[PDB]
Amino acid sequence: AXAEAAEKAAKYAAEAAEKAAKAXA
Amino acid sequence: AXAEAAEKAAKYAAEAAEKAAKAXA
Amino acid sequence: AXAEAAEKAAKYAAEAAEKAAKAXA
Amino acid sequence: AXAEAAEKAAKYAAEAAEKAAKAXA
Amino acid sequence: AXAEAAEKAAKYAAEAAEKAAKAXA
Amino acid sequence: AXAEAAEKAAKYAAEAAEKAAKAXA
Amino acid sequence: AXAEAAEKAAKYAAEAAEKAAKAXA
Amino acid sequence: AXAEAAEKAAKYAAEAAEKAAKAXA
C-alpha cells in the first residue's frame, strides 16, 4: 500500500514535470 | 533543463515504487 | 486541467495525512 | 502536531487548487 | 545548486525518519 | 518498518543528489 | 525546528521564483 | 505574473514560518 501511494505521487509529479518540459520544448 | 531533471527523477521514483509494490506482493 | 490535477493530488495527500493524524489521536 | 500540520498543509493546498480550478473555467 | 538543495531536503527527511524510528525502537 | 523504510529511501535520495552535485562541479 | 526548516524551503522557493521573474522581466 | 505570484506567495509563507519559529522559541 505505501509503495502504491508513493508510485501515485511520483507519477503525478512526473506528469506535471512533463507538461512543464513540453512548454519549454 | 529544470523540468527535464524533475521529470527524470520522478519517473525513476515511480519505477522504484512500482518495483517495490510488485516485490511486496 | 493542471489545477484540477493538483486538487486531486492535494485531496489524496490530505486523506493520507488525516489517517495518520487519526492514528495518533 | 506533525501529522496535524501535514493534514492542514494538504487541505490548504487542496482549497487553493480548487479555487484556481474554478477561476480557470 | 539544485542538487545541493535536493540533498539537504533528503537529509532532512532522513533525519526526520530516523527520529521516528528511534522513538519506535 | 515504515520509519526505517522512509529513512533508507531518503538516504538513497541524498546520496544521489550528492553524486549529482559533485558531477555538475 | 520544523518552522525553521519550512522557512528555508519557502525562501528557496521565493528565490527560485524570483530567478524566473527576473528572466521574464 | 505567474513567477511574480509564486514569489509573493513563497515570501508570505517564509514570513509565516519565521513568525512561528520566533513564537515557538
Ligand SMILES: CCCCCCCCCCCCO[C@@H]1O[C@H](CO)[C@@H](O[C@H]2O[C@H](CO)[C@@H](O)[C@H](O)[C@H]2O)[C@H](O)[C@H]1O
Ligand atoms: C516542516 C518540514 C518542512 C521541510 C521542508 C523541506 C526541507 C527543508 C530542508 C532545510 C535544510 C535542512 O538541512 C539539513 O538538515 C539535515 C537534518 O538535520 C542535516 O543532515 C543530517 O542528517 C543526515 C541524515 O542522517 C546526515 O546524512 C547528515 O550528515 C546530517 O548532517 C543536513 O546536514 C542539513 O543540511
Ligand SMILES: CCCCCCCCCCCCO[C@@H]1O[C@H](CO)[C@@H](O[C@H]2O[C@H](CO)[C@@H](O)[C@H](O)[C@H]2O)[C@H](O)[C@H]1O
Ligand atoms: C531542486 C530543488 C529542491 C528543493 C528542496 C526543498 C528545499 C530545500 C531548501 C534547502 C535550504 C535552502 O536554503 C535557503 O536558500 C534560500 C535561497 O537562496 C535563502 O534565502 C535567500 O532568498 C530569500 C528569498 O528572496 C531571502 O528571503 C533570504 O534573505 C535570502 O537569504 C535562505 O537564506 C537559505 O536558508
